[PDB]
Amino acid sequence: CTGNQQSLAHSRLWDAVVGFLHVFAHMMMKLAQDSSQIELLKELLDLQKDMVVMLLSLLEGNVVNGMIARQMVDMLVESSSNVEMILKFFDMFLKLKDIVGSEAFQDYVTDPRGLISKKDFQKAMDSQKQFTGPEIQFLLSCSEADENEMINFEEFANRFQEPARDIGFNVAVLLTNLSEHVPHDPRLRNFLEL
Amino acid sequence: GQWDRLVLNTPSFPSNYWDKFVKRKVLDKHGDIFGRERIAELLGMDLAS
Numbered sequence: 001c002t003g004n005q006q007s008l009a010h011s012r013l014w015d016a017v018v019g020f021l022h023v024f025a026h027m028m029m030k031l032a033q034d035s036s037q038i039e040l041l042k043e044l045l046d047l048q049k050d051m052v053v054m055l056l057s058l059l060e061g062n063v064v065n066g067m068i069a070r071q072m073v074d075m076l077v078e079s080s081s082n083v084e085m086i087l088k089f090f091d092m093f094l095k096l097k098d099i100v101g102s103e104a105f106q107d108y109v110t111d112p113r114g115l116i117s118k119k120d121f122q123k124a125m126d127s128q129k130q131f132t133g134p135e136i137q138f139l140l141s142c143s144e145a146d147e148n149e150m151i152n153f154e155e156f157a158n159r160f161q162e163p164a165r166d167i168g169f170n171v172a173v174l175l176t177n178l179s180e181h182v183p184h185d186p187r188l189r190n191f192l193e194l
Numbered sequence: 195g196q197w198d199r200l201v202l203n204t205p206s207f208p209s210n211y212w213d214k215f216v217k218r219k220v221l222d223k224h225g226d227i228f229g230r231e232r233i234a235e236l237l238g239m240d241l242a243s
Contacts (some may be wrong), residue, residue, distance in 0.1 A: 104229050128226045 005058060007053045009068055011012065015053070024048060025085040032160075033142045042163050052170045059177060069181045078189050080191075087194050090168050093134060093160045100157045109153075117149040203238040 004109050024044075055072070062068050076083055087114045099105055108124045118140065143151050166189045175192060181190060201207060209212040217239055224233065234242040 102227065104227060107229065 002061070003063075005068065008058065009071065010066070014071065014075045017055075018075060018082075020051065021079050021082045021086075025082050028086065028089060035144065036158075045163060045167055048167045049170060052167075052174055055174065056170075056177070059181075062181060064181050065183075066181065071184060073182060074192065077187050082192050083191065087171075087191070088183065090164065092131075093157075093164070095140070096167075097157050097161065099125075100153050104128070108168055114152065114154060115149065116151050117155055118143075118151060121151060121153075149155065202236070205238050208229070 012123075024047075027044065028041070031037055031044070058068060059072065105124055109122050121143075122136060122140065125131050125139070131139075143156060162178075178188060179192060204208050217237055221233060221242070231243055232238070234240070
């Protein structure tokens, strides 16, 4: 409804989403550091689904290098610091699923019932590359507790795959669609390599 | 594809292929993600670690 599309573009809408992007990052980060409030996190992600999808609606039917798509990448620039906080969050839970499962990690686990200690987890993460130190502190913090030696890794990994199987898909579509329509902008490329 | 599993352990693998280091720079790519202490011997080249 192109006549209607320009109305939202010339509207006090971008300053609303950039605020939403800011508040989405911290609670998504704060909520994960607990096991009882996990239930609220699920419907918080559903809000992310219903927010990014409307950005697709603005972008549908657009011309290459158009004016609507220019503000799409432009709005991301001044919100950049908050955006990669969300992007970094998915990386940890999409690579920990790979670390947990490799036989290299199976060396440090010596517990027939299946659990693992805390300090050994810190060593195993540190032994391998990536996962900068402070991130390891965060991953240990969001893990479980009791006896300081009960960390069930087989369940700790499969607690954010199904609930966050979406969102991650609908940001992949968002970045891919933006990359095509505007093909030459160094600001956009910085996010893509993250 | 498996008869050649009998050559990686000897300390003379790069005899003709010019690249007499086809054994140290594989140790570093895979490296950490796999067993660093176990690929140190399955590609021969003991005392590496």
